[PDB]
From a paper:
Mutant R2Q also led to active-like VSD structures, regardless of Ca2+ binding. Neutralization of either R2 or D142 resulted in the loss of a voltage-dependent S4-S2 coupling and reflected an increase in the activation energy to open the channel. Under apo conditions, the distance between residues N161 and E388 seen in the R1Q (4.3 Å) and R2Q (4.7 Å) variants is equivalent to the distance in the WT Mg2+ (4.3 Å between N161-E388) bound structure. In mutant R2Q, we expected to find a configuration in which the VSDs are active, but the channel is closed since this mutation impairs the coupling to the pore. In the R1Q (apo and Ca2+-bound), R2Q (apo and Ca2+-bound), and R3Q Ca2+-bound structures the S6 gate adopts an open conformation. The resolutions attained for each mutant were as follows: for R1Q, 2.7 Å in apo and 2.9 Å in Ca2+-bound conditions; for R2Q, 3.4 Å in apo and 2.9 Å in Ca2+-bound conditions; and for R3Q, 3.6 Å in apo and 2.6 Å in Ca2+-bound conditions.
The large-conductance calcium- and voltage-activated K+ channel (BK) plays a fundamental role in establishing negative feedback loops to control the firing patterns of neurons, transmitter release, insulin secretion, and smooth muscle contraction. A voltage sensing domain (VSD, segments S0–S4) and a pore-gate domain (segments S5–S6) reside in the membrane. Additionally, two homologous regulators of the conductance of K+ domains (RCK) in each subunit (RCK1 and RCK2) assemble as a tetrameric gating ring (4× CTD) and serve as the cytoplasmic Ca2+ sensor.
Numbering used by the authors:
A (entry chain A): 214 to 561, 567 to 621
B (entry chain D): 14 to 44, 79 to 426
Write the structure that this text describes.
C-alpha cells in the first residue's frame, strides 16, 4: 500500500502503461523487420536492432518522422499504420497529463528560518499584490526608523506575478509561505510562537463584511489557541463584530492586542469634521507615511498643504531637562527651541493624556507624543540639555550633551 | 586526447566543496558579522544598493558576452578537443576574464545564500562548476575543450530576474512575455550545445569511432525542426547518445513549443487596435458619440445622421467606447472612413476626453441600451 495518493496512483499508471506499451511495440516491430515477410518467403527483411525500433517508435509516436529509419516489410509497414492510429492518441494525451501532474507541486512550501535575535511579523488574511503593496509602502517606508523587522506572509494561494516580483525585490526582509493560520502546522512553519506580532487583514471589498469579519475572528481564535501571548492586530469591516473577539479567553489589549475597526474609525474621523470642518483631513494625514516633495507648478496653497502632509505623528522619551516642568512649559520649550509640536504625554498603571493642564508635572522618562517631519526630528527632545544645548540656535546641531 | 582532465576539474571542485559542507554540517550537529555580510550580499545581488544595480548590470552584460564568445568558439572550430597555446587564443583570454568575474559573483551569491548546501546544488552553481574550473585547465595546458561550456546559454535565464531587480518589467503580461521568450531561447540554445557536443564527440562505448561533424548551427536548426515536429531528416542524430538525447528532447520540448507558441500569440495578440487620438482639421466640426455603441445603434443613428437628404454639413462623428468594434461595425466604419472615427476608451476618463478633443467638439451624444435589464441602472 505505497501508492497512498490519487495523483501518485494516476502518475504510476500513466508512466508504466506508456513505457510498457512503447517497449512491447518496439519488440513486435523488431520481430517483424528482422524476420521479414512470410508471404515473400522471408526474402524481404531488414536487420534493425531492438534499440533502432525503440527509437523509431518514439520518432513516430511524436509525429517527428525523420525517415532515417523506416519499416520495409509489408507486415512492418502495416504495423506502423496501426501503431500511428493508436499511439498518437496515447502520446498526445500522456505528455500533457504528465505535465499537469508534475506541474502540480506547491512552490512556497517549507518553513521560515529564525535569524539570531531578529524580529519578524506574520501577516495573513486578504493577501494580494494590492493589499501587500498598500501595506509594505507604509510598513517599509524609508522615513521610518531603521528597524530590522522581517515580514512573513502566510496565505493559501500561489502569489500572482506582480506579487512574486514585489517579494523578489524585498527578498532580504520579506518572505511568503503557502498555508493558513487555521492549521497549527502552518503556524509552526512560520514559527509564530517567536513572531513579534501577527496582523490579520480584511478584504474591504468583500460581498459580505459580516462573513469576512467572522472568518477573521476565526483566525484570531486559531492564532490565540496555538499560542496565547502573540500580539494580534486584526482588521474589522464592521463594529458589531468586535464584541465577539473581546470575549476570546486570552485576548488582551493591555498586552497589546487590538482591532482596527475601519467602520468605527471612518465614522469617528468624519464626525470630528462636524465639530471642526477640515479635521478628518488634518488627522488622516498624520497617520500615513508621506514625504514632502515640492514641484514648481504647485500654487502657494498646494506647497503649504503638502508641507502639512509631510507631517507624521511620532513618539519619543523626553530628556531629563524636561523633568518637573508643567506640560505647558514642555510644549513651549519643544515648539520654541526644538521646533517640535508636543501634544500629549504618558502619565504614570500608566495612561495617555492630551494637552494636560498646568497641574501635571513632567516626570523622568516620560514618553511624549509629537507632530514632526521625521523620527530624526523628535530625537531632539531626547538629547536636549538645559546646560549643553540651551542656546544652540542651529537646531540640527543638537546631539549627545557633555553636560 | 586529454578532455577528461577538464571534466575532472569541475567534479573535484563540486565534490570537495560538497564534502567540506557535509563535514561542517555534521560537526555543528554533533557539538554578528556573518549575518551583516549575508544581508549586505543579499542587498547587493538584489540590486537594492546602487553598487548592487551596477553588479546586476555587469551580470547581465557579461552573460551575453560570454555566450557570444561560446558561439564564436563553437562556430570556428572542428574537433571538440583542440590543441592551441593560450597566449595565441584571444577568445580564451577574454573567456578567462569573464570566468573570473563569474567566480566573484558565485562567491557573492554563496555569501548571500540562506542554506549553503542547497546553494551548492542550485542550477547556476552547476553552470559555474562546469565552466570556471575548465577555463583554468585551458591555461594550465596549451589546449582547450569545447565541453560543457555550452551551459553558458542557461545564464540567460537570469535576465527576467535582472529586469525585475532593475524595475523595468512593470506589467504582469510583460513579465510573462520575457519569462516565456528567455526560458524558451535559453533552453533551445543549451540543448543545441549538448547535441553538438554528443554528435561531434561520438559514442564513448564505441571508443568515439561513431561520430558526426555537425556545426552548432546545424544542431540549432535540427532541434527547431524536431521541436516543431516538422522532421525533415535532412539532418539527424547517429550517435547512440545523440539518438537517446533526441528521444528525451522530443518528450520534453514538444510540450514546451506547443504551449509557448500559443501563449506568445495570445500576448502579442492582446494590444488594443483603436488606441491613439483624433486629429482636429482646420475649422471642421465634430460630434463625440458614446454610451451604447454597436453595429445596430450606430447604423440606426448614421442612417439618419448622414442621410443624403440632409444639407451637406461637414460634421465628423467620433465614437468613443470600451469595446473592440464587431466586424459589421468595422465594415461600416471603413465605408464612412472619410468622416467617421472610432476610439477605444470611456467618457469616465479625462484622458479619453482629451484623446477625442472634446473641448473642441461641437456636441456630445450619449446613447442608451433601450433593451437593458434595468433602465434605472442604465439611466
Ligand atoms: K513530421
Amino acid at each position: 500500500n505505497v501508492l497512498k495518493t490519487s495523483t501518485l496512483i494516476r502518475l504510476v499508471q500513466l508512466v508504466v502503461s506508456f513505457v510498457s506499451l512503447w517497449l512491447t511495440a518496439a519488440g513486435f516491430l523488431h520481430l517483424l523487420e528482422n524476420s521479414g515477410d512470410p508471404f515473400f518467403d522471408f526474402g524481404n527483411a531488414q536487420h534493425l536492432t531492438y534499440w533502432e525500433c525503440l527509437y523509431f517508435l518514439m520518432v513516430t509516436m511524436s509525429t517527428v518522422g525523420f525517415g532515417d529509419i523506416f519499416a520495409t516489410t509489408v507486415l512492418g509497414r502495416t504495423f506502423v499504420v496501426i501503431f500511428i492510429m493508436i499511439f498518437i492518441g496515447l502520446f498526445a494525451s500522456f505528455i500533457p497529463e504528465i505535465a499537469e501532474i508534475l506541474g502540480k507541486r506547491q512552490k512556497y512550501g517549507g518553513s521560515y528560518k529564525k535569524e539570531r535575535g531578529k524580529r519578524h511579523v506574520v501577516v495573513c488574511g486578504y493577501i494580494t499584490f494590492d493589499s501587500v503593496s498598500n501595506f509594505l509602502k507604509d510598513f517599509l517606508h524609508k522615513d521610518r526608523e531603521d528597524v530590522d523587522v522581517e515580514i512573513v506572509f502566510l496565505h493559501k494561494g500561489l502569489p500572482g506575478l506582480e506579487l512574486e516580483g514585489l517579494l523578489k525585490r524585498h527578498f532580504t526582509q520579506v518572505e511568503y509561505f503557502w498555508g493558513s493560520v487555521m492549521d497549527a502546522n502552518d503556524l509552526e512553519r512560520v514559527k509564530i510562537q517567536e513572531a513579534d506580532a501577527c496582523l490579520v487583514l480584511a478584504n474591504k471589498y468583500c460581498q459580505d463584511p459580516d462573513q469576512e469579519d467572522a472568518a477573521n475572528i476565526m483566525r484570531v481564535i486559531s492564532i490565540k489557541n496555538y499560542h496565547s501571548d502573540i500580539k494580534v492586530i486584526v482588521q474589522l469591516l464592521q463594529y458589531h463584530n468586535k464584541a465577539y473577539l473581546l470575549n476570546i479567553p486570552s485576548w488582551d489589549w493591555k498586552r497589546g492586542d487590538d482591532a482596527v475597526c475601519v467602520a468605527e474609525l471612518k465614522l469617528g474621523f468624519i464626525a470630528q469634521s462636524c465639530l471642526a470642518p477640515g479635521f478628518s483631513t488634518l488627522m488622516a494625514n498624520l497617520f500615513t507615511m508621506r514625504s514632502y516633495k515640492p514641484t514648481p507648478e504647485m500654487s502657494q496653497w498646494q506647497t503649504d498643504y503638502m508641507r502639512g502632509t509631510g507631517m507624521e505623528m511620532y513618539t519619543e522619551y523626553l530628556s531629563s531637562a524636561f523633568n518637573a516642568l508643567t506640560f505647558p512649559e514642555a510644549a513651549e520649550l519643544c515648539f520654541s527651541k526644538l521646533k517640535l509640536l508636543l501634544l500629549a504625554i504618558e502619565v504614570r498603571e500608566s495612561t495617555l493624556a492630551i494637552n494636560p493642564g498646568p497641574k501635571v508635572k513632567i516626570e523622568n522618562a516620560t514618553q511624549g507624543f509629537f507632530i514632526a517631519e521625521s523620527a530624526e526630528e523628535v530625537k531632539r527632545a531626547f538629547y536636549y540639555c538645559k546646560n549643553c544645548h540651551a542656546n544652540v540656535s542651529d537646531v540640527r546641531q543638537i546631539k549627545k550633551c557633555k553636560c | 586526447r586529454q578532455w577528461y582532465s577538464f571534466l575532472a576539474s569541475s567534479l573535484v571542485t563540486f565534490g570537495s566543496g560538497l564534502v567540506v559542507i557535509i563535514i561542517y554540517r555534521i560537526v555543528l550537529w554533533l557539538c554578528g558579522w556573518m549575518t551583516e555580510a549575508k544581508d549586505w550580499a543579499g542587498e547587493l545581488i538584489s540590486g537594492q544598493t546602487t553598487t548592487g544595480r551596477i553588479l546586476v548590470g555587469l551580470v547581465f552584460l557579461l552573460s551575453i558576452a560570454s555566450l557570444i564568445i561560446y558561439f564564436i568558439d563553437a562556430s570556428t572550430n572542428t574537433s571538440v578537443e583542440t590543441c592551441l597555446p593560450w597566449s595565441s587564443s584571444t577568445t580564451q583570454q577574454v573567456d578567462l576574464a569573464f570566468n573570473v568575474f563569474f567566480m566573484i559573483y558565485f562567491f557573492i551569491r554563496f555569501v548571500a545564500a540562506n542554506d549553503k548546501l542547497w546553494f551548492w546544488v542550485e542550477l547556476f552553481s552547476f553552470v559555474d562548476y562546469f565552466t570556471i574550473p575548465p577555463s583554468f585547465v585551458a591555461i594550465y595546458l596549451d589546449r582547450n575543450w569545447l565541453g560543457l561550456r555550452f551551459l553558458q546559454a542557461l545564464r540567460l535565464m537570469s535576465i527576467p530576474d535582472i529586469l525585475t531587480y532593475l524595475n523595468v518589467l512593470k506589467t504582469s503580461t510583460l513579465i510573462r512575455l520575457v519569462q516565456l521568450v528567455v526560458s524558451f531561447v535559453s533552453l533551445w540554445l543549451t540543448a543545441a550545445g549538448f547535441l553538438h557536443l554528443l554528435e561531434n564527440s561520438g559514442d564513448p562505448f564505441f571508443d568515439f569511432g561513431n561520430a558526426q561533424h555537425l556545426t552548432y548551427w546545424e544542431c540549432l536548426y535540427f532541434l527547431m525542426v524536431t521541436m516543431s515536429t516538422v522532421g525533415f531528416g535532412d539532418i539527424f542524430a547517429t550517435t547512440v547518445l545523440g539518438r537517446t538525447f533526441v528521444v528525451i528532447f522530443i518528450m520534453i520540448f514538444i510540450g514546451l513549443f506547443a504551449s509557448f507558441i500559443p501563449e506568445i500569440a495570445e500576448i502579442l495578440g492582446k494590444r488594443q487596435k483603436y488606441g491613439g487620438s483624433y486629429k482636429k482639421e482646420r475649422g471642421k466640426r465634430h460630434v463625440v458619440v458614446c454610451g451604447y455603441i454597436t453595429f445596430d445603434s450606430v447604423s440606426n443613428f448614421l442612417k439618419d445622421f448622414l442621410h443624403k437628404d440632409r444639407e451637406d454639413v461637414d460634421v465628423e462623428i467620433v465614437f468613443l467606447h470600451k469595446g473592440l468594434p464587431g466586424l459589421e461595425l468595422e465594415g461600416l466604419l471603413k465605408r464612412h472612413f472619410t468622416q467617421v472615427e472610432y476610439f477605444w476608451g470611456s467618457v469616465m476618463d479625462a484622458n479619453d476626453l482629451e484623446r477625442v478633443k472634446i473641448q473642441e467638439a461641437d456636441a456630445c451624444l450619449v446613447l442608451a441600451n433601450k433593451y437593458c435589464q434595468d433602465p434605472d441602472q442604465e439611466d
